[PDB]
Amino acid sequence: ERPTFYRQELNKTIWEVPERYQNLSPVGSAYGSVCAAFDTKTGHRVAVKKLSRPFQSIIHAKRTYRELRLLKHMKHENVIGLLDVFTPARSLEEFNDVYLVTHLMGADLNNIVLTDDHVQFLIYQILRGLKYIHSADIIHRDLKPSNLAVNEDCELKILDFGLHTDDEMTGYVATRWYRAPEIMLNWMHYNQTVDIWSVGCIMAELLTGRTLFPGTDHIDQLKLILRLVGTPGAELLKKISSESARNYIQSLAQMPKMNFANVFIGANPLAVDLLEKMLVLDSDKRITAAQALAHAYFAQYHDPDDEPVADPYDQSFESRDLLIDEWKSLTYDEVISFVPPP
Numbered sequence: 035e036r037p038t039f040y041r042q043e044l045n046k047t048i049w050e051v052p053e054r055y056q057n058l059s060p061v062g063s064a065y066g067s068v069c070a071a072f073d074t075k076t077g078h079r080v081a082v083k084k085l086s087r088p089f090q091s092i093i094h095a096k097r098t099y100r101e102l103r104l105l106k107h108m109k110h111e112n113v114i115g116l117l118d119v120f121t122p123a124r125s126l127e128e129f130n131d132v133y134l135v136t137h138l139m140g141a142d143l144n145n146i147v148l149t150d151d152h153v154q155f156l157i158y159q160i161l162r163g164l165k166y167i168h169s170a171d172i173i174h175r176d177l178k179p180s181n182l183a184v185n186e187d188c189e190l191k192i193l194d195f196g197l198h199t200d201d202e203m204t205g206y207v208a209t210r211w212y213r214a215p216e217i218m219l220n221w222m223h224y225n226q227t228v229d230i231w232s233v234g235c236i237m238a239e240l241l242t243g244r245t246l247f248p249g250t251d252h253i254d255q256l257k258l259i260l261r262l263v264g265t266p267g268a269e270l271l272k273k274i275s276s277e278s279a280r281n282y283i284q285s286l287a288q289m290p291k292m293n294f295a296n297v298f299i300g301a302n303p304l305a306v307d308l309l310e311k312m313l314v315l316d317s318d319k320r321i322t323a324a325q326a327l328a329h330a331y332f333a334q335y336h337d338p339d340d341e342p343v344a345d346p347y348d349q350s351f352e353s354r355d356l357l358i359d360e361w362k363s364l365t366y367d368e369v370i371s372f373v374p375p376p
């Protein structure tokens with residue numbers, strides 16, 4: 035049953051991996067270190083990630099379990115999937131290290147970023163993967179061009195699910211430019227509609243070649259957003275939980291929604307229409323992924339018999355309080371029960 039493992043030291047780290055993985059070469063590294071390799075069982079080039087200190091605290095142990103549960107569930111053409119997971123440990127008593135294996139992704143959408151046909155195909159694939167993700171009541175939370183892998187045939191996969199520090203979100207940073215305003219400013223309990231705001235920001239940028247809302251800080255970014263989509267009406271104001279955030283919003287002079295045909299000059303009128311339905315300030319009123327797939331902009335690609343949904347996903351663990359070793363034991367069980375894809 036158990037494969038043979040071999041050891042080697044690569045850039046100050048000991049890696050112990052099954053013989054099937056060959057020609058390990060470092061390609062990146064606080065969450066872990068990553069090597070590219072060739073998988074002789076499948077023939078794919080793969081990425082192998084060795085987790086750093088996976089069980090050093092309750093918070094870290096629960097994050098390790100969360101990542102493994104999510105990656106084991108995702109089985110969709112437009113979403114990253116898990117090729118393998120392994121540990122050199124022979125028992126729970128000696129279990130300390132976790133390794134995760136995926137397909138090696140080449141370029142992300144940044145490098146690419148285009149005909150209108152290209153934009154149709156790229157955004158279609160993002161929405162097809164999001165319909166699947168949202169059907170399992172999962173929220174990605176961090177959709178942006180660097181988290182979308184694209185190959186030579188324009189085929190796309192969503193990766194790097196949100197599993198973010200205050201400093202990471204400060205200033206003139208791409209880590210904030212794609213976030214929905216209700217989550218950027220903690221206006222209210224958010225839901226899956228935050229991901230659709232992100233898709234609108236991405237689509238606009240593929241059409242113009244420019245970041246839609248490149249704010250120099252949170253407040254500058256909010257001002258850019260409200261200039262395009264208008265200031266809130268009383269209906270949305272009621273839904274903002276913070277009295278102080280409500281107070282700040284009402285300090286701003288009122289502004290009407292702009293004409294999107296005069297912003298996105300020359301774009302396909304169907305693309306302009308779809309952007310007006312994604313970039314809505316009130317998250318209750320945004321288009322959903324399932325609704326967007328049926329929009330006329332995607333008529334060339336839409337096939338309602340080839341847009342699958344996910345098996346149900348139990349996240350009850352997220353409200354559970356456990357000790358370090360109880361999270362560690364749950365993780366061990368998930369490593370040893372992994373069944374590889376066909």
Ligand SMILES: O=C1CC(c2ccccc2)=NN1c1ccccc1
Pocket residue numbers: 061062063068081082083134135136139
């Ligand atoms: O978290 C990361 C980062 C990563 C990667 C970084 C640099 C170059 C190429 C790949 N691969 N991964 C990953 C690898 C295996 C399983 C899950 C995620």
Ligand SMILES: [Cl-]
Pocket residue numbers: 037038052053054055
């Ligand atoms: Cl092997």
Ligand SMILES: [Cl-]
Pocket residue numbers: 121122123128129130131132
């Ligand atoms: Cl181990």
Ligand SMILES: [Cl-]
Pocket residue numbers: 144178179180181208
């Ligand atoms: Cl990015």
Ligand SMILES: [Mg+2]
Pocket residue numbers: 180181194
């Ligand atoms: Mg990323």
